[PDB]
C-alpha cells in the first residue's frame, strides 16, 4: 500500500480533498451526513404536532408526535455528529502532526 504522507517541499500548498487522511473517504463521514439530513425530519414532526395543536386538532396524539419528533431529531443529530467526528479524526491528528491544513 501507498505511504501515509507524500513529498511536500516548503512553499508548496496543495488542493488535497482526496488525500488519504481526508474525511471525505473514511465512510463514517458519509453515514453522519445521512443521519444529519435525517434528523431534520424530527424537527418537521414536532412542528407539525405543535402547529396542529395550536388550531385545536390532533388532540389525542400531538404530545406523542412531539415526543417522537424530538427524540428522533436528537438521536439522529447526535449519532450523526459523533460519526462526523469519527470521520474527521485522522485529519485532525494530521493537522497536529504537521503545520499543514490545506
Amino acid at each position: 500500500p501507498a505511504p501515509e504522507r507524500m513529498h511536500y517541499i516548503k512553499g508548496y500548498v496543495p488542493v488535497a480533498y482526496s488525500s488519504p487522511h481526508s474525511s471525505l473517504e473514511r465512510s463514517a463521514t458519509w453515514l453522519g451526513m445521512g443521519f444529519l439530513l435525517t434528523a431534520l425530519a424530527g424537527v418537521g414532526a414536532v412542528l407539525f404536532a405543535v402547529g396542529a395543536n395550536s388550531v385545536g386538532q390532533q388532540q389525542e396524539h400531538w404530545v406523542l408526535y412531539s415526543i417522537i419528533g424530538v427524540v428522533f431529531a436528537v438521536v439522529c443529530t447526535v449519532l450523526g455528529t459523533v460519526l462526523i467526528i469519527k470521520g474527521r479524526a485522522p485529519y485532525n491528528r494530521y493537522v497536529k502532526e504537521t503545520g499543514r491544513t490545506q
Binding site: G44, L47, F48, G51, A52, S54, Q57, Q58
Partner: protein
C-alpha cells in the same frame, strides 16, 4: 393566517389576482398568500438586484479602466458565510411550514357541524347535485330531512354483482355503482343547461364528491379550494367529504372542472348560487312538495333568475363558434 394583508392597492398587488374568498377559510388562505408574497418579493428583489449589480459594477472593462489588472481576487471559500446562507433558508422554511400546517389544519378539518349535506356526482361531462341531509332548522317541515331515494339507491346497490357471474374485481362487478348517491331532490346538468346548486348563507355545509367514471375536480375559485372527485373513492383512500363553516355573502359563483377528463373537459361548468336562509327553506319546501317541478321553476319561485349567470352553456355545434359567439342564451 389570522393577520389581514396590507390592503389597498398594495393588497391588490400582493394577492396577485386571487378572489376575495366567500368563506372564512378562503379568507385565511388569502391572508397567508399575501404574506408569503411579501416574503417572495423581498427575496426576488434583492437577488435580481444582485444580478443587476453583476451587470453594472463587477464588469471587466470597469475593472480595467480603474487599474484592477488581469484577474480578480481568487477567493473560493468562506466557511462561515456559506454556512450561514444555508442555515438561514432552513429556519425560513421551518416558519413557512408552521404557518402552512396551521392553515392546512383549519381548511382540512371535518368537525364543522354541517347543517346541509350535498351529494355531488361528476360524470363525462357534467354534474349532478342532490341534497343528502338538511338538518331541521331550515328543513322542509322542520324535521331533519334525509334525501335518499330508497328504490333507486337499492337498484344501484344491487348492481354491485353480476348475476351472470362476471365478478372480477375482488368479488364485485366491474360496473359497480353502489358508491354513488341517489336523492329525491336532484339537479342534473345537460349540454343545454348549467346545473345551479342552491345553498344558504351563514350555514355550515358539507360536500360529498364522487365520479361515475373518470377523475374530475370540483374547483370553485371563490372558495379558493378544489378537490378531485374519484370513482370508488374508498378504494383509492380518497377523502370524499369536505366541509365549509359558512358562505359569508350571497350571489352566483362559477365552478369548473380542474382535472383532465377527456373531450368536453372545458365545458363541464356549474353554478353555485347562494341565497338567504329562509329563501333556501322555501326552495327546498317547494321542491320537496312537487318533485316533478324543475330547478329553474323553483329558482323563479324564490325570486331568483331561472338559469345560471356566472356561466352559460356552450353551443354544441362543432363549427358555429368559429366567429366568436360560443354561448347560447336562455329565456
Amino acid at each position: 393566517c389570522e393577520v389581514a394583508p396590507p390592503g389597498g392597492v398594495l393588497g391588490d398587488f400582493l394577492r396577485m389576482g386571487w378572489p376575495d374568498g366567500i368563506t372564512p377559510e378562503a379568507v385565511a388562505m388569502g391572508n397567508f398568500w399575501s404574506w408569503v408574497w411579501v416574503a417572495a418579493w423581498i427575496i426576488g428583489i434583492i437577488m435580481w438586484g444582485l444580478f443587476l449589480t453583476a451587470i453594472f459594477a463587477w464588469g471587466a472593462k470597469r475593472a480595467e479602466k480603474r487599474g484592477e489588472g488581469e484577474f480578480p481576487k481568487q477567493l473560493q471559500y468562506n466557511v462561515p458565510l456559506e454556512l450561514v446562507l444555508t442555515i438561514v433558508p432552513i429556519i425560513i422554511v421551518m416558519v413557512l411550514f408552521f404557518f402552512t400546517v396551521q392553515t392546512q389544519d383549519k381548511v382540512t378539518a371535518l368537525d364543522k357541524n354541517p347543517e346541509v349535506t350535498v351529494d355531488v356526482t361528476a360524470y363525462q361531462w357534467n354534474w349532478k347535485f342532490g341534497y343528502s341531509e338538511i338538518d331541521g332548522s331550515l328543513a322542509p317541515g322542520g324535521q331533519d330531512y334525509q334525501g335518499s331515494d330508497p328504490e333507486r339507491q337499492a337498484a344501484a346497490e344491487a348492481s354491485k354483482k353480476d348475476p351472470s357471474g362476471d365478478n372480477p374485481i375482488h368479488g364485485n362487478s366491474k360496473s359497480d355503482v353502489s358508491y354513488l348517491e341517489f336523492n329525491r331532490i336532484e339537479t342534473l346538468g345537460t349540454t343545454d343547461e348549467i346545473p345551479v346548486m342552491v345553498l344558504p348563507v351563514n350555514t355550515p355545509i358539507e360536500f360529498n364528491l364522487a365520479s361515475a367514471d373518470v377523475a374530475h375536480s370540483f374547483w370553485v375559485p371563490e372558495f379558493l379550494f378544489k378537490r378531485d372527485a374519484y370513482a370508488h373513492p374508498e378504494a383509492n383512500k380518497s377523502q370524499r367529504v369536505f366541509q365549509i363553516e359558512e358562505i359569508t355573502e350571497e350571489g352566483a359563483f362559477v365552478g369548473r372542472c380542474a382535472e383532465m377528463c377527456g373531450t368536453y373537459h372545458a365545458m363541464m361548468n356549474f353554478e353555485l348560487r347562494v341565497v338567504d336562509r329562509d329563501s333556501f327553506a322555501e326552495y327546498i319546501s317547494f321542491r320537496d312538495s312537487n318533485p316533478d317541478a324543475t330547478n329553474a321553476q323553483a329558482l323563479e319561485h324564490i325570486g331568483q333568475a331561472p338559469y345560471a349567470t356566472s356561466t352559460s352553456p356552450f353551443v354544441s355545434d362543432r363549427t358555429a363558434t368559429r366567429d366568436g359567439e360560443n354561448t347560447q342564451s336562455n329565456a
